[PDB]
């Protein structure tokens, strides 16, 4: 069940899709992979599975070196991103195909399929072939086929993508439970930021075949190790203002906002390898921007976009001397036009800072719920 990767590399001739990747997944640990579309998430899974060849490096599942083991003998099961359902067999036959190859009893097979089909709301669809199913039903068939098989390593490749919000919740809890009932290793790939946050005992960020950062869910949200990671976790994206260093203290850095007024602000952020004058990049999340009336540092501009979400309102503002729009989030339904003058408060204790090479300056303000 313990899956470990050391200096794992995958090349497609000259194109490198995974470079020197190192991970350590302990038994019963829920590890969630995230990264941009086409960065190598599935490639990592398919190497763990044994459906792709590892170019160089070692793969250890159960402390056994599995580089050259056939797929069957790996103790690994996978919900394929492309489903790969047997299109000649019913939902039932699909979900029971794994145990039919084991020496399973008919009453064992029929009992644990009717149970796992009930939690995925597939009760009624049990006789249909994949042709006679919806996209989200086929996806659920794929999830079920693996839950029935109950392997030492659960690999789940974007398994919830094609389900409604309300169901995507109901599946999340059943997977959450199964991880705590079996106590077995699950590697779970998703784009859904909420899933990444809730299900993960630990999250891995990928970036063009490179491990960007590993850590707890709150550990990445609050403390990205660089610019890329900061821009990837949390939707909407984190706003980025180009700033200049004016003064440095060991415990903090003072910077200058690019507006006409050349306002200055002290940020609780390490000054390790930061020179006065040099150009940084100030990160601040839409959630963290304050209302103007109760702030020391104010930024003002013109509203470009307003998106009414019901629960909240999202307001994109063009603030002079910055090319990019600042995205701001407000609780409740807010009545704003396009072109209205809008001002937002910027809180120094919640500002991230990144060097010219993109690396973050460790935030020294202790945020709640971080070990």
């Amino acid at each position: 069940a313990s899956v470990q990767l050391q200096n794992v590399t995958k090349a497609w001739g000259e194109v490198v899709v995974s470079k020197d990747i190192n991970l350590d997944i302990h038994e019963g640990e829920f590890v969630v992979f995230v990264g941009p579309s086409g960065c190598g998430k599935s490639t990592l899974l398919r190497m763990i599975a044994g459906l792709e060849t590892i170019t160089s490096g070692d793969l250890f599942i159960g402390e056994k070196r599995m580089n050259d083991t056939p797929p069957a003998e790996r103790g690994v099961g996978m919900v394929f991103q492309s489903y790969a359902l047997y299109p000649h067999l019913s939902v039932a036959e699909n979900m029971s195909f794994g145990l039919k190859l084991a020496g399973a009893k008919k009453e064992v097979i029929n009992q644990r399929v009717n149970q796992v089909a009930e939690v995925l709301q597939l009760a009624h669809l049990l006789d249909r072939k994949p042709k006679a199913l919806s996209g989200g039903q086929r996806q659920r068939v794929a999830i079920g086929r693996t839950l029935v098989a109950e392997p030492s390593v659960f690999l789940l490749d974007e398994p919830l993508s094609n389900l409604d919000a309300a169901l995507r919740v109901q599946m999340r809890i059943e997977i959450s439970r199964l991880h705590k009932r079996l106590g077995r290793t699950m590697i779970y790939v998703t784009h859904d930021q909420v899933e990444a946050m809730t299900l993960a005992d630990k999250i891995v960020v990928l970036d063009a075949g490179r491990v960007a950062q590993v850590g707890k869910p709150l550990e990445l949200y609050h403390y990205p190790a660089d610019r890329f990671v900061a821009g990837f976790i949390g939707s909407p994206k984190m706003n980025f203002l180009p700033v200049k260093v004016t003064a440095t203290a060991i415990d903090q850095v003072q910077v200058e906002l690019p507006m006409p007024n050349r306002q200055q602000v002290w940020l609780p952020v390490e000054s390790r390898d930061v020179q006065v004058g040099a150009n940084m990049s100030l990160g601040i999340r839409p959630e963290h921007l304050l209302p103007s009336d109760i702030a020391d540092v104010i930024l003002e501009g013109e509203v470009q976009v307003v998106e009414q979400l019901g629960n909240e309102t999202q307001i994109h503002i063009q603030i002079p001397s910055i090319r990019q729009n600042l995205v701001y989030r407000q609780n409740d339904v807010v009545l704003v036009e396009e072109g209205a003058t809008f001002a937002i408060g910027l809180p120094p204790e919640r500002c991230h800072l990144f060097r010219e090479d993109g690396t973050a300056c460790r935030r020294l303000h202790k945020e709640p719920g971080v070990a």
Binding site: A49, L51, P70, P71, A72, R74, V76, G77, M78, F80, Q81, S82, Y83, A84, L85, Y86, P87, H88, F97, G98, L101, A102, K129, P130, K131, A132, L133, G135, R138, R145, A149
Partner: protein, 293 residues
């Protein structure tokens, strides 16, 4: 399930097919004419002036009262021959499909030293002019015959065994169809624990059913109609295939055209049946809903 259109396109095709059919059926309707014409004439009117049933009666076993009074019994067991043609072709085809299919699986899903050499070796070595082959085959089955008598000369076993040599093409054919089925279906199988054989039998074959029917049809036809090998190997009249047997109707100066044409029509029958049965295996969209992409 899909919404269909101008239905003049159906009308124009229905007509251009009907005319095509008539044109290609006409040479065959000429044969049915010969088998119904009295005496033995290779050429006459399409609906013969003098229609006889004597040719079809002698093929079917019935005795014929001729002009002078005497009843002619059937000279040959034409029907038995047809039964022999079926056993030999049928079993042979089962054998060809079975061999070429497993052989194909390895060429398409497995990797081993000299794969391209053998596949291109198969294609090339079968395309050799088989002119002095009969002189070689007789020598094999003559020898083989004393060690295993079941597959020697004058045995249906020997004939079937000889036909199991021509799989080269069929291997290419099934290798091909295999490759258009998504890999991830057999990967999913493998991860469910299935051995390569189980993946081959439970996942891949059922989806390759149409091409297998094709290979079976193409074998059957080849073997019903085959004359040289089978005529060389079989010696007892009651073991003759319908192809081999109807050679009796062909002589130095004349052919018994009527008897021969009736035999020629019967050999089309088992093919028509087998072709018709294979249809339930010739379905579209067997992969439908399997793989997203």
């Amino acid at each position: 399930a899909m919404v269909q259109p101008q239905k003049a396109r159906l009308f124009i095709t229905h007509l251009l097919l009907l005319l095509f059919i008539a044109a290609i059926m006409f040479p065959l309707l000429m044969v049915v004419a010969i088998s119904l014409r009295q005496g033995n004439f290779a050429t006459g009117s399409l609906i013969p002036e003098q229609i006889s049933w004597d040719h079809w009666k002698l093929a079917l076993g019935f005795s014929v009262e001729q002009a002078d009074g005497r009843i002619t019994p059937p000279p040959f067991p034409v029907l038995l021959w047809l039964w022999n043609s079926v056993k030999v072709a049928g079993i042979s085809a089962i054998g060809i499909v079975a061999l070429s299919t497993t052989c194909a699986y390895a060429f398409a899903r497995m990797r081993f030293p000299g794969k391209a050499t053998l596949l291109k070796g198969m294609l090339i070595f079968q395309m050799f002019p088989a002119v002095l082959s009969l002189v070689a085959l007789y020598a094999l089955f003559d020898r083989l015959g004393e060690y295993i008598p079941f597959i020697g000369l004058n045995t249906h076993g020997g004939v079937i065994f000889a036909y199991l040599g021509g799989i080269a093409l069929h291997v290419w054919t099934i290798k091909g169809y295999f490759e258009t089925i998504d890999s991830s279906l057999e990967e999913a199988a493998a991860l469910d624990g299935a051995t390569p054989w189980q993946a081959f039998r439970l996942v891949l074959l059922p989806l390759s059913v149409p091409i297998l029917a094709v290979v079976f049809i193409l074998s059957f036809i080849a073997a019903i109609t085959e004359v040289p090998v089978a005529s060389l190997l079989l010696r007892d009249v009651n073991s003759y295939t319908l192809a081999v047997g109807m050679q009796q109707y062909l002589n130095p100066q004349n052919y018994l055209w009527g008897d021969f044409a009736a035999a020629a029509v019967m050999s089309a029958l088992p093919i028509t049946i087998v072709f018709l049965l294979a249809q339930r295996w010739l379905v579209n969209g067997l992969t439908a809903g399997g793989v997203k992409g």
